[PDB]
Amino acid sequence: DDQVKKIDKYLYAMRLSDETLIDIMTRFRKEMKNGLSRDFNPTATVKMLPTFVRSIPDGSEKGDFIALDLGGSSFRILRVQVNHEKNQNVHMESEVYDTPENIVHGSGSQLFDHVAECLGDFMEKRKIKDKKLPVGFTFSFPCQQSKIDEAILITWTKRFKASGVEGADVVKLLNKAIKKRGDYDANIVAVVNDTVGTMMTCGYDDQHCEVGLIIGTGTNACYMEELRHIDLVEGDEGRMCINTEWGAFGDDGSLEDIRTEFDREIDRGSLNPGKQLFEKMVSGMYLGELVRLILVKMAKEGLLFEGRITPELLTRGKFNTSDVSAIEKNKEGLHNAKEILTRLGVEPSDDDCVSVQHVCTIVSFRSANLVAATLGAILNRLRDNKGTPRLRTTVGVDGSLYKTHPQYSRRFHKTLRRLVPDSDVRFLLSESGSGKGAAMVTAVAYRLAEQHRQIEETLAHFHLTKDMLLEVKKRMRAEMELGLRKQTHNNAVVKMLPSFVRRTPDGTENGDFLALDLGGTNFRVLLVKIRSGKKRTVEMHNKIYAIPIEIMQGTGEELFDHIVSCISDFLDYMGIKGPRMPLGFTFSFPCQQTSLDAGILITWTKGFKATDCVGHDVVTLLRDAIKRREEFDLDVVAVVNDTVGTMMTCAYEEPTCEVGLIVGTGSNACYMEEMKNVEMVEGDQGQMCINMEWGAFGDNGCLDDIRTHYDRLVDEYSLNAGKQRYEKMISGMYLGEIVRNILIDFTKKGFLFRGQISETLKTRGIFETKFLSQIESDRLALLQVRAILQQLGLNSTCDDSILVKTVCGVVSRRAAQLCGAGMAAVVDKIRENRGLDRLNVTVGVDGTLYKLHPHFSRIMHQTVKELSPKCNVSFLLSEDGSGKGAALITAVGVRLRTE
Ligand SMILES: O=P(O)(O)OC[C@H]1O[C@@H](O)C[C@@H](O)[C@@H]1O
Ligand SMILES: O=P(O)(O)OC[C@H]1O[C@@H](O)C[C@@H](O)[C@@H]1O
Ligand SMILES: OC[C@H]1O[C@@H](O)[C@H](O)[C@@H](O)[C@@H]1O
Ligand SMILES: OC[C@H]1O[C@@H](O)[C@H](O)[C@@H](O)[C@@H]1O
Ligand code: NA
Ligand code: NA
């Protein structure tokens, strides 16, 4: 008995006490917290990787798929087919392919071309090639994942080292391999660790399974953690499976007091020197060689075989984990020991067979004990999560060692239940391997992949290519010609209306002017005092007056009576009642003008629909309201479009400015055109500012090409169906409605909001410019996005908030690009007008969508640069409004009136 009580002291360091295993467990409990926290995760050795699997199979899984399995003892390819609907119990066929060491050690090309060739064969053996079966992929290696169908290899472990893989996406790699063959197609829909595949396989049968355990070639475990603990994943709703990759436990010296001279030597001879240290004490790829190393030592010290030693006893890997298991069998161990020890050359004595069988015990007992230490920590985490005074869960298991060693399972279960007896645990053992749990993962993945595909399909229609945009640019330019030319003008949709402003501020303007700003979001009256000379100044005041629902749609007389009434109040407000003042009237609507002071309303746009206004001269209508009140008297000198007012405002200080752009409630533009080109106004000397009214672009159908189902709905339900189509794809009054319709369709399709179309969501105008701008802000936490949505009255989840955000982006982006194509055409026509090769020009811009949106102006400028590369455009934001420009225009008006 001394021959045994002696080994017990020699391999003393490889016998851990419960006191010890407790310290280990405590330490792994910490490693978990560090792996999960976003602050320390990058330093932690236990990666606690997110798997993107939300829960064990429930039964609703259904379909037919192919599963791959690489990284374990054998490279297997399965096929899991199941429909409960047709009442078709889970069914599955599998197979194994030989993969020579030269492949597992060659280039990724070799390895993945190999896997691709085997998948080919496997499919050419059932003729399931033409079947669009979803492929699942079990990859037993640590992987970086941001989505279930992405797997960036962090590092090879166990027996694999293939060049050109670490850091790449094995998904893209396999796809490439297959592609090169063109032998068939394959939709890799998911990738999971074998721990995860195992947890899913067992969960299917045991709805309490919350853990996955692999003790085969290598060791590793996964568990269901609370999303409120997974710092590295946006969300708190529910739970997700974490792949601990605990093999790396202690790769940073953590376990330098547990590791022995033996562990260090096997390491110095291993494939991954320094890494997977905890694992190198456990998995069945090392145990055999650990024993051999211990036996070489003892032998060298004469503790065995008379101190005899052969070349075989010194050869790496002559001792298998098989032999370790074969020696530990109850009835036959010593017999086997003899045989194995005899093949080794040494002269095995019945005593040697007893010592060796004991080294195997100490070594195998330790592996199981360690996995107990760590698993005990996982359970401690679960119980803590639940809060229950007693954990009651199930642990899935798989792996050659655990499956074949006649003493391992037995010993391990006992140690664990002892370290954490405050819990009743069941150890369900996989029998299908991973196929089942894996295919159950693929089912869900594919499901979600299909929705996603339909989504991208719909949103794809909103994507415009460089060439598409250049077409839009070209069409815009053509429509411009049609509008300017007297022959085609009457039918042209882009009216190219003359403003009668012939030049930008010349610096002589001087005086006091009243002003009106009508058509934007805020109607106001202004007082503008301009002083020219050496020391030139501008001083303005204004007041916003609200316009009531009745009035805005109502009778012209009503509307202009309200306006004049507001003018009256403002006069009192400014303490200036009674002098006859010159008035500049900014009226943001298409007007046919025969002079600066006459404007006939061509048609209402945006939200305005007063009766008996269209066809009338708005200056007359105003003069009447002034007459009718008979309080004060004004001298209305000019009517001006906000575009033109904006250009003039910005020209005041920036003489390079010759273009006006508005992107607010509506969208429109203006620019300085050569009189020789304005065929609608007699004369060919100098210039004329042209109010384009480009919102009407597309009204003749020249954009049916790119308008979508959602664009048509918005147009069709608007106050002006069939009109202002281009603007309805750009401005703040409409973008939201477009988005709203997209969402209504997605909800009906079941992609959003659980498929329930809220009353709120059926309220038109819900997505105001302000909301859109907030929703698209950068580095904005989903929690914040979801908050904004609940504010509007939309009860949404993280996934919803994400989809909504994507939709808003697609729409606002398209708007910025379409707007860019228009401006691109404009600046290019100017460049030509001046016969330049390169033109520097600046644009005066105003509008709420333009000011508030965090991407619009940017994408718009970018687009203008790309489409008109021979122009360098500068966009200058107007911060005052139109008052200055309107005033500057009114000044020249007076100089012509008093002329
Ligand atoms: O074959 P081993 O590496 O010993 O054990 C681990 C393997 O178990 C197999 O039943 C399924 C594989 O997904 C897993 O990787
Ligand atoms: O109010 P929005 O329609 O967003 O922006 C357009 C408005 O911008 C205002 O600063 C000046 C108005 O002349 C113009 O109509
Ligand atoms: O296959 C068993 C385990 O081996 C470990 O070395 C790998 O890092 C894990 O991905 C895997 O779960
Ligand atoms: O307010 C911005 C633009 O809105 C368009 O709908 C109007 O018809 C234009 O006259 C105006 O410049
Ligand atoms: Na989280
Ligand atoms: Na002309």
Short mmCIF file of C-alpha atoms and ligand atoms in Angstrom, two decimals, residues 49 70-73 139-143 155-158 193-196 213-221 243 245-248 272 276 279 283 286, ligand 3:
data_model
loop_
_atom_site.label_atom_id
_atom_site.label_comp_id
_atom_site.label_asym_id
_atom_site.label_seq_id
_atom_site.Cartn_x
_atom_site.Cartn_y
_atom_site.Cartn_z
CA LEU A 49 -18.49 36.24 -25.67
CA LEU A 70 -15.69 21.41 -37.05
CA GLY A 71 -13.18 21.71 -34.22
CA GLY A 72 -14.18 18.58 -32.31
CA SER A 73 -12.79 15.05 -32.59
CA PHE A 139 -17.32 26.09 -34.89
CA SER A 140 -15.71 25.09 -31.58
CA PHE A 141 -13.41 28.13 -31.39
CA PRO A 142 -13.54 31.55 -29.71
CA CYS A 143 -15.22 33.94 -32.16
CA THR A 155 -7.62 32.42 -32.04
CA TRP A 156 -7.18 28.75 -32.94
CA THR A 157 -7.14 26.29 -30.03
CA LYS A 158 -6.74 22.53 -29.57
CA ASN A 193 -19.92 27.22 -30.36
CA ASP A 194 -20.33 23.54 -29.51
CA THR A 195 -21.08 24.57 -25.92
CA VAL A 196 -24.02 26.57 -27.24
CA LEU A 213 -20.58 21.95 -21.14
CA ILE A 214 -17.90 20.43 -23.36
CA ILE A 215 -15.22 18.14 -22.02
CA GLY A 216 -13.77 16.49 -25.11
CA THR A 217 -10.65 17.42 -27.05
CA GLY A 218 -11.02 20.78 -25.29
CA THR A 219 -13.07 22.27 -22.45
CA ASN A 220 -15.53 25.16 -22.39
CA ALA A 221 -18.95 26.21 -21.08
CA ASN A 243 -19.84 31.59 -24.38
CA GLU A 245 -14.41 30.32 -23.30
CA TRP A 246 -13.02 29.45 -19.87
CA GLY A 247 -10.19 27.43 -21.40
CA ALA A 248 -8.21 30.67 -21.33
CA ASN A 272 -0.60 27.39 -28.60
CA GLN A 276 -5.68 27.85 -22.92
CA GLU A 279 -7.88 23.84 -20.52
CA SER A 283 -9.43 18.43 -21.86
CA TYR A 286 -3.56 16.81 -22.99
O1 LIG B 3 -14.57 22.30 -28.34
C1 LIG B 3 -14.42 22.49 -26.92
C2 LIG B 3 -13.88 23.91 -26.64
O2 LIG B 3 -12.48 23.95 -26.96
C3 LIG B 3 -11.95 25.22 -26.57
O3 LIG B 3 -10.52 25.20 -26.69
C4 LIG B 3 -12.49 26.24 -27.56
O4 LIG B 3 -11.90 27.51 -27.29
C5 LIG B 3 -14.01 26.34 -27.45
O5 LIG B 3 -14.51 27.07 -28.58
C6 LIG B 3 -14.69 24.96 -27.42
O6 LIG B 3 -15.99 25.10 -26.82
#
